[PDB]
Design an enzyme around this catalytic site. Structure first.
Site, mmCIF file in Angstrom:
data_model
loop_
_atom_site.group_PDB
_atom_site.id
_atom_site.type_symbol
_atom_site.label_atom_id
_atom_site.label_comp_id
_atom_site.label_asym_id
_atom_site.label_seq_id
_atom_site.Cartn_x
_atom_site.Cartn_y
_atom_site.Cartn_z
ATOM 1 N N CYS A 116 -10.458 -92.327 -9.036
ATOM 2 C CA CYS A 116 -11.441 -93.120 -8.302
ATOM 3 C C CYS A 116 -12.861 -92.735 -8.622
ATOM 4 O O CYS A 116 -13.667 -93.571 -9.044
ATOM 5 C CB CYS A 116 -11.258 -92.966 -6.807
ATOM 6 S SG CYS A 116 -9.665 -93.516 -6.222
ATOM 7 N N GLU A 117 -13.171 -91.465 -8.396
ATOM 8 C CA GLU A 117 -14.513 -90.957 -8.642
ATOM 9 C C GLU A 117 -14.824 -90.920 -10.128
ATOM 10 O O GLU A 117 -15.988 -90.953 -10.522
ATOM 11 C CB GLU A 117 -14.676 -89.574 -8.001
ATOM 12 C CG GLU A 117 -14.410 -89.599 -6.502
ATOM 13 C CD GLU A 117 -15.465 -90.364 -5.699
ATOM 14 O OE1 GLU A 117 -16.170 -91.208 -6.283
ATOM 15 O OE2 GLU A 117 -15.583 -90.134 -4.474
#
Length: 257
Positions: free
Chosen positions: A179-180
């Protein structure tokens, strides 16, 4: 809604390639805002409207990650046995269908790792291989064994209060790498650079703090679209002065509209 596949253990398939490939499919669903270098993700809604599914496979096992396209964040994951595990606890409302089970804890970095910064999350390919293999076995249970040996009362109580410490650990490694990694090119650059290093790789204290302010630097992204000379406290607070440095940090911004 659309799948991506990453052969974790395949040393010839670089992490940077997967990122570059997955961002390209996500940007297909983004908009181009004038004054904003980064693509703007779909507007957020109560009910995730487009889903990114990333299947992480080893040589042994695999799991699928359910990610909202609007904020690029993990909602849950599916085991090889077809069991969906979602962030939340009894009483909440399931976003996942197919008989999802509540993990019992939320997806906040601080449901996850308490008040220890992101710089404590060791990443890498080996780290991702173990996380998937581990989560592919997410169990419902711990009936296990204080009959084995209280008078380990210390052990017994640690297990009782933090049963999925292991799961929380494996989950926050994928949250940052995937995600990041997708949101910040500062993370994808750092995770790719040390992805095959023998002792793992981590993000600096400062990186972690910016990562945790994705919403804020997304808002600034929009503010700089209107007034590109404006100074931003919340930004300089983070070691970011101007849209130019911001472009070296965030790859995709959260839609303010």
């Amino acid at each position: 809604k659309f799948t991506e596949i990453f052969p974790v253990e395949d040393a010839n398939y670089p992490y940077s390639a997967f990122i570059a490939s997955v961002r390209k499919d996500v940007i297909k669903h983004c908009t181009d805002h004038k004054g904003i270098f980064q693509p703007v993700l779909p507007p957020e809604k109560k009910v995730p409207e487009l889903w990114l599914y990333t299947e992480l496979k080893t040589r042994t096992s695999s799991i699928t990650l359910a990610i909202r396209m609007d904020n690029l964040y993990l909602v849950g994951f599916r085991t090889p046995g077809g069991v969906w595990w979602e962030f939340g606890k009894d009483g909440d409302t399931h976003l996942l269908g197919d008989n999802p089970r509540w993990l019992g804890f939320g997806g906040r970095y601080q449901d996850l790792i308490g008040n220890k910064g992101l710089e404590t999350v060791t990443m890498g390919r080996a780290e991702m291989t173990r996380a998937v293999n581990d989560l592919a076995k997410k169990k419902k249970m711990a009936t296990l064994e204080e009959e084995e040996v209280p008078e380990a009362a210390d052990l017994a109580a640690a297990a009782a209060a933090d049963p999925q410490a292991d799961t929380k650990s494996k989950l926050v490694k994928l949250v940052v790498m995937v995600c990041e990694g997708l949101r910040f090119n500062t993370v994808s650059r750092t995770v790719d650079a040390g992805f095959n290093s023998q002792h793992g790789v981590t993000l600096t204290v400062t990186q972690g703090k910016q990562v945790q302010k994705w919403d804020r630097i997304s808002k600034a992204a929009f503010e700089w679209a209107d007034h590109p000379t404006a100074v931003i406290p919340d930004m300089q607070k983070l070691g970011i002065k101007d849209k130019n440095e911001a472009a070296r940090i965030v790859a995709l911004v959260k839609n303010q509209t």
